């Protein structure tokens, strides 16, 4: 019973209880509770192997394992948590010697991850010094601001060059520093000392549980000295932390103080390869069903013109560059972009929403709701002295992500013409009176293009329909059609399938097996240690067939190709080689181009 006067907490209890818990530890998930799971030693001892042998410091660790153990530890950790957490670090810093006594025991650890929240909208006096974790989407990308910890002194006679660190804010003054004979008066200087880093960026909560017609309400907090630009800013992320408060300087004439207290959260943590299962990796490549099988997975319920799931073939087994290590010239980036054209309310958002609901780099857009110039970080008025900064653009924070765009022929001429270069150049020359540079960003594009009309007018080859010329309307490889089959035949099918999606009350695990995650990992392996080349085999095809590509150009109101889409073809070459097991070029791949292209390119009848 040795305790702060105003509390009920003690070091030894929690220390011993947790050291027994980690001795009551074999991975209690994978060796006590999930015995059907298995990695059989206390994982933290295992880590003191797989940390020390890894030599890879600053562990990360939760504490939700502790529900089985005595919950009083849970509580007094919940409520008094800046005064027990170092004790659990001390237990770890003791565990060092369980597995290596005579190590280089000079480094420390970093570190929760267990408790709940619902939302930020409304909290209470009770919820003042307690553990919380909440999530949303990030807004900003800050700079650093350090923070002091100690005073380094000076002297006048005989070098009374004293020193001393800070509790948090005071140094004392008798007539000299650490009163040493007072040959002179007190001394201080403030630089040769200890400093500490941080930042500040805020979050926008973005769940599906956002109350009705309500605005953004948003939160923010600093960092600590290792938690500092962990962060490609702006995405769906959770934090843990400890609700903090602070009084405020009333007015500013003098030391008066406010009644109201501002709040933020303490600064801790954030939230986001296997040799074991090699078998199926090769198993799926050598299976010719890649054309459709995973494509069959993507739309979970929808066949909606499943030649578009073969258009989803276009898209993943990840996308190789022909970067230019030999000559160094020209920066030939292997970019990819296609659209999903309109004139019928088809799934030209729903797929884009399926994607954004899945990929974290998640944004949805369209004409007339926002500006073309949302790469600005506007200085309408700032918390500065008009040191006008355009901190970070918005539409470009999708680093190899996606922004979904809808209703594309919606905006003015300046909009959507301004982007005639970034597509295959990823440069944004900031040549304004303010600060200047040539920046970099490149990513993926998809939208729901629309002509001047609702329905494609018949009798009338496609180059006439959209109001772009036969250079810009005929630009890409193919910008793909979306029609109604003119009959009831197709119509009733997905009705009959998915009329009862309410009423099915089940899902069928067919031979087109709904891969829970066995899909999601192979693609992550899909780019690592084989490297698609291009030798002498699969290139002469449209070397020669450029005859066939362009000699349809003799014609107005018909259309041939132009020499950026051949680039799009050599970029098509990259994907299929490794998977199906020749990382050197095979010839069939160009057929996929003809399988794609002349589906609406030699549909040039007149």
């Amino acid at each position: 019973q040795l305790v702060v006067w105003g509390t009920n907490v003690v070091v030894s209890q929690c220390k011993s209880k947790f050291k027994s818990f980690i001795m009551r530890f074999i991975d209690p998930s994978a060796e006590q509770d999930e015995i059907s799971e298995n990695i059989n030693q206390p994982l933290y001892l295992q880590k003191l192997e797989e940390i020390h042998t890894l030599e890879e410091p600053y562990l990360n660790l939760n504490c939700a394992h502790l529900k089985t153990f005595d919950q009083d530890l849970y509580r007094q950790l919940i409520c008094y948590p800046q005064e027990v957490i170092p004790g659990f670090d001390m237990a770890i810093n003791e565990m060092f010697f369980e597995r290596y006594p005579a190590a280089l025991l000079e480094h420390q650890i970093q570190v929760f991850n267990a408790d709940k929240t619902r939302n930020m909208r409304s909290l209470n006096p009770e919820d003042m010094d307690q553990l919380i974790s909440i999530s949303g989407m990030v807004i900003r990308s800050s700079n650093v601001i350090p923070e002091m910890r100690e005073a380094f002194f000076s002297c006048n006679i005989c070098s009374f060059s004293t020193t001393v660190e800070v509790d948090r804010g005071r140094i004392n003054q008798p007539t000299l520093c650490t009163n040493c004979n007072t040959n002179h008066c007190f001394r201080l200087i403030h630089n040769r000392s200890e400093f500490t880093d941080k930042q500040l960026v805020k979050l926008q909560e973005s769940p599906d549980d956002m109350a009705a017609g309500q605005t953004p309400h948003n939160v923010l907090l600093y960092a600590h000295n290792d938690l500092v630009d962990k962060v490609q800013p702006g995405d769906r992320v959770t934090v843990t932390g400890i609700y903090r408060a602070t009084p405020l300087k009333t007015g500013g004439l003098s030391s008066s103080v406010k009644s109201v207290y501002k709040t933020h959260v303490d600064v801790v943590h954030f939230r986001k390869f296997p040799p074991e299962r090699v078998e199926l990796l090769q198993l799926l490549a050598k299976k010719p069903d890649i054309y459709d099988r995973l494509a069959r997975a993507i739309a979970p319920s929808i066949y909606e013109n499943d030649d578009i799931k073969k258009g989803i073939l276009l898209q993943l087994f990840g996308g190789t560059k022909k970067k230019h290590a030999t000559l160094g010239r020209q920066n030939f980036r292997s970019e990819i972009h296609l659209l999903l054209c309109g004139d019928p309310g088809t799934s030209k958002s729903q797929m884009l929403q399926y994607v954004f609901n899945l990929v974290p780099r998640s944004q949805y857009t369209s004409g007339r709701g926002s500006s073309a110039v949302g790469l600005t970080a506007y200085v309408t008025k700032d918390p500065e002295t008009r040191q006008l900064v355009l901190q970070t653009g918005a539409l470009v924070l999708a680093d190899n992500g996606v922004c979904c765009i809808d209703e594309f022929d919606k905006m003015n001429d300046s909009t959507r013409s301004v982007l005639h270069e970034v597509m295959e150049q990823q440069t944004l020359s900031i040549a304004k009176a303010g600060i200047i540079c040539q920046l970099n960003a490149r990513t993926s594009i998809l939208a729901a293009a629309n002509p001047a009309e609702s329905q494609w007018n018949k009798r009338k080859n496609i180059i006439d329909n959209v109001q772009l010329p036969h250079t810009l309307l005929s630009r890409f490889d193919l910008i793909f059609l979306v029609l109604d089959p003119q009959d009831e035949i197709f119509d009733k099918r997905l009705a009959s399938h998915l009329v009862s999606l309410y009423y099915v009350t089940r899902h069928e695990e067919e031979d087109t097996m709904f891969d829970m995650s066995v899909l999601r990992d192979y693609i992550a392996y899909a780019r690592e240690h084989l490297s698609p080349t291009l030798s002498d085999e699969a290139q002469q095809r449209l070397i020669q067939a450029y005859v066939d590509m362009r000699k349809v150009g003799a014609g107005r109101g018909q259309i041939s190709a132009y020499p950026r889409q051949l680039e799009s073809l050599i970029r098509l070459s990259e994907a299929h080689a490794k998977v199906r097991l020749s990382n050197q070029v095979e010839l069939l791949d160009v057929e996929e181009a003809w399988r794609l292209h002349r589906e609406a390119l030699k549909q040039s009848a007149t």
Binding site: S141, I145, P146, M148, N191, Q232, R329, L397, T471, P563
Partner: protein, 159 residues
């Protein structure tokens, strides 16, 4: 710009310098600064430095010979074969954009744009001038911006 990250921008940082280092700086150059980071006694951060390392002594294709100056153009002995043999022009049509093909008129014409103009000795009543106004058009999908981008590597202040 030799260092350039994804996502992030060439953020700004601020600095002072001494008398002999002062007003000896011009547009976009590559110098070697000193890493003496220092505090603001407001705090916020700053930094400081004391040393920089940004054609009489000669350019590449040389070793030391004599000229109007020390080695300003000294290496006539090796230049001059490539000075007068007027088919050298074809090197300047061929041996300069070998990775590229278009018309052969631009690739025989740009050079004097890069090179000095008139710079004569006449009036105060009015200036005479050397360089010329210039253009290039066509339509895209014809490789009409490779070249401009390359100049930034080729030539100075090819912004």
């Amino acid at each position: 710009q030799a260092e350039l990250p994804r996502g992030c921008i060439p953020r700004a940082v601020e600095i002072i310098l001494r008398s002999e280092l002062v007003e000896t700086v011009q547009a976009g150059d590559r110098y070697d600064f000193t890493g003496t980071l220092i505090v603001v006694p407001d705090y916020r951060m700053a930094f400081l430095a004391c040393s920089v390392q940004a054609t009489d002594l000669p350019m590449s294709e040389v070793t030391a010979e004599d000229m109007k100056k020390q080695m300003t153009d000294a290496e006539w002995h090796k230049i001059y074969e490539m000075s007068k043999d007027r088919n050298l022009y074809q090197n300047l049509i061929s041996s300069l954009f070998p990775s590229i093909y278009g018309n052969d008129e631009v690739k025989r014409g740009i050079l004097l744009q890069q090179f000095g103009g008139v710079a004569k000795t006449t009036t105060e009543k009015t200036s005479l001038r050397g360089d010329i106004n210039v253009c290039i058009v066509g339509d895209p999908s014809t490789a009409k911006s490779q070249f401009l981008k390359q100049v930034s590597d080729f030539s100075p202040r090819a912004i």
